[PDB]
Amino acid sequence: ITALETAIILIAFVVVASVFAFTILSAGTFSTERGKEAVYAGLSEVRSSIEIKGSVVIIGE
Amino acid sequence: ITALETAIILIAFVVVASVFAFTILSAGTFSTERGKEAVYAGLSEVRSSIEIKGSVVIIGE
């Protein structure tokens, strides 16, 4: 007797673990993507800049 | 577990540096502009003298 039912719980747990493992794999991929994008965005902002060259001229009507 | 955690803290520190960096850039531009005004202001004052020519005359009522 004891042999047969042990099989059922045996399958039941591995299926749950596999489904959980699949979710972690998908979740981990999204997290890394978000982190990578943040670094690229930060570097772009620091680099961009404008400076004024020469004197300012004003024209009277 | 440690992977998912580390992404969240990592983004937090990058954003803080980005905001701090932006503040420095804007702050530094103001300082340079103010320093430049002083030199032009100083030079203008030195050359703006005036001089008396001739003799002084008084008219009797």
Folded structure, characterized:
This is part of a larger assembly, with two copies of chain A (61 residues). By secondary structure, chain A is mostly helical. In chain A, 75% of the residues lie in helices and 0% in strands. Chain A contains one helix and no strands. Chain A has one helix spanning 2-47. The longest helix of chain A is centred in the middle third of the chain and has 46 residues, at 2-47. The first copy, chain A, is rod-shaped, with a radius of gyration of 30 Å. Chain A binds chain B through residues 27-28, 31-32, 34-35, 38-39, 42, 45-46, 49, and chain B through 3-4, 7, 10-11, 14-15, 17-18, 21-22, 25. Chains A, B: This is Flagellin. Chains A, B: The chain crosses the membrane at residues 1-25.
Structure at a glance:
The structure is cut from a larger assembly and holds two copies of chain A (61 residues). With 61 residues, chain A is mainly alpha-helical.
Descriptors for this entry?
part of a larger assembly; 2 chains; 61 residues; mainly alpha; protein fibril
Number of helical regions of chain A: 1
Number of strands of chain A: 0
- Could you give a short account of the major beta sheet of chain A? none
Oligomer: part of a larger assembly
How much β-strand is present in the residues of chain A? under 5%
What would you call the structural class of chain A? mainly alpha
Largest interface: A-B, 12 and 12 residues
Rg value of chain A:
30 Å
The 3D shape of chain A can be described as: rod-shaped
Distance between the termini of chain A: 105 Å
Roughly how much helix do the residues of chain A carry, as a percent range?
A: over 70%
Order of SSEs of chain A: H
Protein name (chains A, B): Flagellin
Transmembrane segments (chains A, B): 1-25
Keywords (chains A, B): Membrane, Transmembrane, Transmembrane helix
Organism (chains A, B): Litorilinea aerophila
